[PDB]
Homo-oligomer: A and B are copies of this chain.
Amino acid sequence: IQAEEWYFGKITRRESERLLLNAENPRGTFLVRESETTKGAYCLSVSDFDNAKGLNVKHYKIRKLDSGGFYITSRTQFNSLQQLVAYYSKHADGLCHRLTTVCP
């Protein structure tokens, strides 16, 4: 997945929030990183805006099933990470915002 624009590898949770939390960035700017402590998991980081908290980053753990697939909820699972990203770019389904822009 190294070659996917949205994959930032092993940046920490804090570093993903420093990258994402920028006022030039739209709601739904996102990146995927390898989870910092859970081994074999990915994490989807999405900026979001709430009146109160202002801009903040939500983090959703992505698990990989034994057969290979990926999921965030029981609603949909994906044969690959790129399919998950493609799906959520069009359908938020429970995430805070549709994935609009890859982290610059």
Contacts and interface: CB of A to CB of B under 8 A. Distances in A.
Interface in A7-28: 8, 12-15, 18-19, 21
Count of identical protomers in the assembly: 2
Chain A interface secondary structure, helix, strand, loop or mixed? Answer: loop
A12 B54 contact: no
Contacts of A2: 21, 53-56
A104 B14 contact: yes
A37 B15 contact: yes
A14 B5 contact: yes
A85 interface: no
B13 A8 contact: yes
B18 A36 contact: yes
